[PDB]
Design a protein around this motif. Structure first.
Motif, PDB file in Angstrom:
ATOM      1  N   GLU A 124       0.833  -1.200   0.000  1.00  0.00           N
ATOM      2  CA  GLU A 124       0.000   0.000   0.000  1.00  0.00           C
ATOM      3  C   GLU A 124       0.867   1.249   0.000  1.00  0.00           C
ATOM      4  O   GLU A 124       0.613   2.190  -0.761  1.00  0.00           O
ATOM      5  CB  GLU A 124      -0.952   0.005   1.204  1.00  0.00           C
ATOM      6  N   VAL A 125       1.914   1.263   0.832  1.00  0.00           N
ATOM      7  CA  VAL A 125       2.775   2.436   0.913  1.00  0.00           C
ATOM      8  C   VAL A 125       3.544   2.637  -0.387  1.00  0.00           C
ATOM      9  O   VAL A 125       3.687   3.770  -0.859  1.00  0.00           O
ATOM     10  CB  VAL A 125       3.711   2.320   2.124  1.00  0.00           C
ATOM     11  N   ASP A 126       4.040   1.549  -0.995  1.00  0.00           N
ATOM     12  CA  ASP A 126       4.585   1.659  -2.350  1.00  0.00           C
ATOM     13  C   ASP A 126       3.603   2.391  -3.260  1.00  0.00           C
ATOM     14  O   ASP A 126       3.997   3.264  -4.031  1.00  0.00           O
ATOM     15  CB  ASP A 126       4.905   0.269  -2.942  1.00  0.00           C
ATOM     16  N   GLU A 127       2.314   2.057  -3.160  1.00  0.00           N
ATOM     17  CA  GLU A 127       1.313   2.606  -4.070  1.00  0.00           C
ATOM     18  C   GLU A 127       1.119   4.099  -3.850  1.00  0.00           C
ATOM     19  O   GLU A 127       1.116   4.879  -4.807  1.00  0.00           O
ATOM     20  CB  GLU A 127      -0.014   1.867  -3.894  1.00  0.00           C
ATOM     21  N   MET A 128       0.931   4.521  -2.598  1.00  0.00           N
ATOM     22  CA  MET A 128       0.747   5.946  -2.363  1.00  0.00           C
ATOM     23  C   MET A 128       1.982   6.726  -2.778  1.00  0.00           C
ATOM     24  O   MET A 128       1.861   7.822  -3.334  1.00  0.00           O
ATOM     25  CB  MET A 128       0.396   6.227  -0.907  1.00  0.00           C
ATOM     26  N   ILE A 129       3.173   6.158  -2.558  1.00  0.00           N
ATOM     27  CA  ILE A 129       4.416   6.853  -2.892  1.00  0.00           C
ATOM     28  C   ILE A 129       4.513   7.077  -4.399  1.00  0.00           C
ATOM     29  O   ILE A 129       4.834   8.178  -4.857  1.00  0.00           O
ATOM     30  CB  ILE A 129       5.631   6.081  -2.344  1.00  0.00           C
ATOM     31  N   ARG A 130       4.202   6.047  -5.192  1.00  0.00           N
ATOM     32  CA  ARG A 130       4.266   6.196  -6.646  1.00  0.00           C
ATOM     33  C   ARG A 130       3.217   7.177  -7.141  1.00  0.00           C
ATOM     34  O   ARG A 130       3.492   8.004  -8.021  1.00  0.00           O
ATOM     35  CB  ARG A 130       4.077   4.841  -7.330  1.00  0.00           C
ATOM     36  N   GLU A 131       2.016   7.118  -6.565  1.00  0.00           N
ATOM     37  CA  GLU A 131       0.913   7.923  -7.070  1.00  0.00           C
ATOM     38  C   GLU A 131       0.982   9.376  -6.609  1.00  0.00           C
ATOM     39  O   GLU A 131       0.475  10.262  -7.307  1.00  0.00           O
ATOM     40  CB  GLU A 131      -0.424   7.303  -6.646  1.00  0.00           C
ATOM     41  N   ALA A 132       1.596   9.649  -5.461  1.00  0.00           N
ATOM     42  CA  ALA A 132       1.535  10.982  -4.887  1.00  0.00           C
ATOM     43  C   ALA A 132       2.638  11.925  -5.377  1.00  0.00           C
ATOM     44  O   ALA A 132       2.540  13.137  -5.148  1.00  0.00           O
ATOM     45  CB  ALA A 132       1.577  10.895  -3.360  1.00  0.00           C
ATOM     46  N   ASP A 133       3.674  11.428  -6.051  1.00  0.00           N
ATOM     47  CA  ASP A 133       4.708  12.320  -6.585  1.00  0.00           C
ATOM     48  C   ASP A 133       4.238  12.883  -7.929  1.00  0.00           C
ATOM     49  O   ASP A 133       4.706  12.515  -9.011  1.00  0.00           O
ATOM     50  CB  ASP A 133       6.043  11.601  -6.709  1.00  0.00           C
ATOM     51  N   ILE A 134       3.287  13.814  -7.840  1.00  0.00           N
ATOM     52  CA  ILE A 134       2.652  14.322  -9.052  1.00  0.00           C
ATOM     53  C   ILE A 134       3.643  15.074  -9.917  1.00  0.00           C
ATOM     54  O   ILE A 134       3.650  14.913 -11.145  1.00  0.00           O
ATOM     55  CB  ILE A 134       1.444  15.209  -8.715  1.00  0.00           C
ATOM     56  N   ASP A 135       4.510  15.879  -9.313  1.00  0.00           N
ATOM     57  CA  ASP A 135       5.352  16.720 -10.147  1.00  0.00           C
ATOM     58  C   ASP A 135       6.567  15.982 -10.702  1.00  0.00           C
ATOM     59  O   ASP A 135       7.224  16.515 -11.596  1.00  0.00           O
ATOM     60  CB  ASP A 135       5.741  17.994  -9.376  1.00  0.00           C
ATOM     61  N   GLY A 136       6.864  14.772 -10.217  1.00  0.00           N
ATOM     62  CA  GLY A 136       7.861  13.914 -10.837  1.00  0.00           C
ATOM     63  C   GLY A 136       9.297  14.115 -10.401  1.00  0.00           C
ATOM     64  O   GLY A 136      10.209  13.640 -11.090  1.00  0.00           O
ATOM     65  N   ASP A 137       9.545  14.792  -9.285  1.00  0.00           N
ATOM     66  CA  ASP A 137      10.917  15.066  -8.864  1.00  0.00           C
ATOM     67  C   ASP A 137      11.465  14.037  -7.877  1.00  0.00           C
ATOM     68  O   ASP A 137      12.589  14.208  -7.389  1.00  0.00           O
ATOM     69  CB  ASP A 137      11.006  16.466  -8.253  1.00  0.00           C
ATOM     70  N   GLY A 138      10.692  12.992  -7.553  1.00  0.00           N
ATOM     71  CA  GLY A 138      11.132  11.949  -6.650  1.00  0.00           C
ATOM     72  C   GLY A 138      10.842  12.188  -5.183  1.00  0.00           C
ATOM     73  O   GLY A 138      11.260  11.375  -4.347  1.00  0.00           O
TER      74      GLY A 138
END
Ligand code: CA
Ligand code: CA
Ligand code: CA
Lengths: 139, 64
Positions: free
Chosen positions: A113-127
């Protein structure tokens, strides 16, 4: 703010909880559904849940109250919750710190789940997931 | 500090509300005691996640 297609969908869901068909949802029926899902609710947890929704105070949930709950600001609350863990006052915490708080405290999310929020929440793409990006994802 | 558990639970139940609108989310994998998650399961899960989010919100505000 309510489709008529949503209203019938919520009526069907209501039925799955109100198994006696008396137009009401009690603590026993909520307990029954949650145990049917393999969850292990406490009787206070069931009480907190009914209380949060039960607008008239008669200990039970009927369908207009159910309808309101499903239809129901939250932003500032989420912001306050994030600031609790804000050490250095920056707009962010490290992904590792986030993974810790999400997996080791409160509800205890899974690592996938945490993998998922981390991938989805970096909207601007800077890591780096910051607070504002996290809020926008949910809103 | 009463606020750390309340605040974490608020974050976690909020995200769990959000993840449940996506049918492919890994949030659906935590119901280990169901073999085949069907439509009636998902709908009752959606309702229980919403209620728990509202509980977490009241408890956070109660801790402040
Ligand atoms: Ca009933
Ligand atoms: Ca009521
Ligand atoms: Ca970012």
């Amino acid at each position: 703010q309510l489709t008529e297609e949503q209203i019938a969908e919520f009526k069907e869901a209501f039925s799955l909880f109100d198994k006696d068909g008396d137009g009401t949802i009690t603590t026993k029926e909520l307990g029954t559904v949650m145990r049917s899902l393999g969850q292990n609710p406490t009787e206070a947890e069931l009480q907190d849940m009914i209380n949060e929704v039960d607008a008239d105070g008669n200990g039970t949930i009927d369908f207009p109250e159910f309808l309101t709950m499903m239809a129901r600001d939250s932003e500032e609350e989420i912001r306050e919750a994030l600031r609790v863990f804000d050490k250095d006052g920056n707009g962010y915490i490290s992904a590792a710190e986030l993974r810790h708080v999400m997996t080791n405290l409160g509800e205890k999310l899974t690592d996938e789940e945490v993998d998922e929020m981390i991938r989805e929440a970096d909207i601007d793409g800077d890591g780096q997931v910051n607070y504002e990006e996290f809020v926008q994802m949910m809103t | 500090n009463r606020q750390i558990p309340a605040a974490a639970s608020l974050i976690q139940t909020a995200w769990r509300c959000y993840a449940a609108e996506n049918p492919d989310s890994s949030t659906w994998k935590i119901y280990i005691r169901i073999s085949q998650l069907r439509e009636h399961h998902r709908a009752t899960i959606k309702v229980i996640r919403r209620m728990q989010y509202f509980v977490a919100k009241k408890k956070f505000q109660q801790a402040r």
